[PDB]
Amino acid sequence: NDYCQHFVDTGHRPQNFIRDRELIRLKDELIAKSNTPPMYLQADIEAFDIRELTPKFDVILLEPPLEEYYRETKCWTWDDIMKLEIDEIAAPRSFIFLWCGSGEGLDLGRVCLRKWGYRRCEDICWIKTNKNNPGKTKTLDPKAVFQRTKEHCLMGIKGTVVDIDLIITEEPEIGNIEKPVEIFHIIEHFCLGRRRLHLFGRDSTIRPGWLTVGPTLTNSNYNAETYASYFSAPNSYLTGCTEEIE
Amino acid sequence: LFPPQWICCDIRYLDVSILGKFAVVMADPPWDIHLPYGTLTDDEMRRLNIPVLQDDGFLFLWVTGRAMELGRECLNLWGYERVDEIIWVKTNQLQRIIGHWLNHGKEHCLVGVKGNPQGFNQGLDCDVIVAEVRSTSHKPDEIYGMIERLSPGTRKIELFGRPHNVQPNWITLGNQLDGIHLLDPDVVARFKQRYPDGIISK
Numbered sequence: 354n355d356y357c358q359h360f361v362d363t364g365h366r367p368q369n370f371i372r373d374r375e376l377i378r379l380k381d382e383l384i385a386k387s388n389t390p391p392m393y394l395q396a397d398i399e400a401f402d403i404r405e406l407t408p409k410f411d412v413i414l415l416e417p418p419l420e421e422y423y424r425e426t427k428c429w430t431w432d433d434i435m436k437l438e439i440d441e442i443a444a445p446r447s448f449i450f451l452w453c454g455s456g457e458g459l460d461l462g463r464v465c466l467r468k469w470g471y472r473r474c475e476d477i478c479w480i481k482t483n484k485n486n487p488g489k490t491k492t493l494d495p496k497a498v499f500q501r502t503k504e505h506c507l508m509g510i511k512g513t514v515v516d517i518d519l520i521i522t523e524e525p526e527i528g529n530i531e532k533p534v535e536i537f538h539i540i541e542h543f544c545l546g547r548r549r550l551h552l553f554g555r556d557s558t559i560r561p562g563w564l565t566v567g568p569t570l571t572n573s574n575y576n577a578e579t580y581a582s583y584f585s586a587p588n589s590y591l592t593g594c595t596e597e598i599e
Numbered sequence: 600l601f602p603p604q605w606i607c608c609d610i611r612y613l614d615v616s617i618l619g620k621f622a623v624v625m626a627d628p629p630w631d632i633h634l635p636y637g638t639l640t641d642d643e644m645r646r647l648n649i650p651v652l653q654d655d656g657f658l659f660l661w662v663t664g665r666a667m668e669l670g671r672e673c674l675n676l677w678g679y680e681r682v683d684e685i686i687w688v689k690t691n692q693l694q695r696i697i698g699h700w701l702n703h704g705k706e707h708c709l710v711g712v713k714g715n716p717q718g719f720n721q722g723l724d725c726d727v728i729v730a731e732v733r734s735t736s737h738k739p740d741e742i743y744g745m746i747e748r749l750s751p752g753t754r755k756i757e758l759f760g761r762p763h764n765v766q767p768n769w770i771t772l773g774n775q776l777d778g779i780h781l782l783d784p785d786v787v788a789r790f791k792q793r794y795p796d797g798i799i800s801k
């Protein structure tokens with residue numbers, strides 16, 4: 354029945370009580386085969402000319418370190434984020450996935466998307482269960498009306514033109530900023546192209562199929578000409594979900 | 600008064616100034632996202648007279664599709680800051696989960712603040728509702744508990760509600776309600792003065 358009343362009663366978030374043919378999984382196999390080697394580049398993204406990142410990208414995953422992620426433990430402001438020249442490295446048809454937190458980011462992240470030329474097509478929520486800490490209460494942002502138990506990742510399309518829009522995992526430990534890896538599965542399952550950029554990635558997010566750029570990477574291997582060779586003809590327009598070309 | 604109250608009307612044409620001030624406003628509008636009978640265009644939405652209904656308190660605004668952006672616009676136009684955003688995860692009777700890119704598992708309701716609301720129990724509930732789909736187009740009754748716990752005993756107003764939404768402490772407006780049912784004496788007085796024959800025209 355009333356899981357909101359139940360949360361008031363016991364401290365168990367309503368999302369603790371959500372439960373759970375086909376097969377797919379061949380799509381994952383196709384993705385895995387189609388993936389370019391993992392590439393990565395440590396770069397201070399404030400100080401970095403974004404335009405050295407070529408070629409233009411089919412997908413961009415943008416995960417700027419917001420102050421709100423450091424509740425109990427350089428942060429970027431939405432002022433800083435807005436000034437990124439994201440449109441200078443996006444392909445004319447391309448997609449963006451932006452982690453917006455759960456406060457003013459839900460509005461300012463929309464402003465960013467419009468500033469860079471996308472329209473929002475999906476609102477993906479990461480819902481945090483607290484099954485292992487019903488006791489731990491939440492320190493509220495002054496403006497908050499409710500306890501904030503979720504983060505939003507916004508999807509954006511620019512140009513001309515399966516999974517659910519929810520991710521449910523347990524709330525990470527205090528100070529752990531990692532977003533759920535499932536976002537990568539959602540993104541890859543869209544089959545949007547093979548040029549995938551992850552800005553503000555980390556040593557721990559590097560992944561095949563992706564180019565990771567971020568200030569805390571300890572190693573770099575990115576080379577714009579090596580990277581461009583993975584998409585030269587005849588591979589220019591693979592979705593990322595088809596067989597390689599012999 | 601306290602028990603359910605309501606007004607069948609065209610919310611575009613009602614003079615809501617007769618209704619007084621409310622601690623909580625809730626609206627589940629017929630956005631023109633896909634034009635069914637009852638839908639409002641974006642300018643009509645924009646020109647609703649929300650700003651007279653509150654001095655200090657909260658607004659709850661259900662949004663979907665592109666009204667996620669448009670409702671943010673009306674919300675700000677009407678004088679509110681968006682300070683929270685509730686999601687209702689839609690489950691079946693066994694608590695399993697039931698936009699052309701991803702299937703939708705949830706519904707969104709913006710929460711807006713106006714003025715400095717004082718005396719509210721901010722932080723009792725959390726921003727996720729997990730509840731069971733009744734009839735389609737029904738909102739979950741859980742939202743009324745969260746609102747009552749947040750602002751207990753206060754005046755509330757719902758816009759575009761249906762007969763199943765009528766609640767103690769609330770005045771429900773909608774065009775599929777069954778006539779006018781008003782108990783609060785201040786409201787009954789102003790309604791009589793403004794509508795001496797009981798019609799609601801221009």
Ligand SMILES: [Mg+2]
Nearest residue numbers: 381538539542
């Ligand atoms: Mg997968």
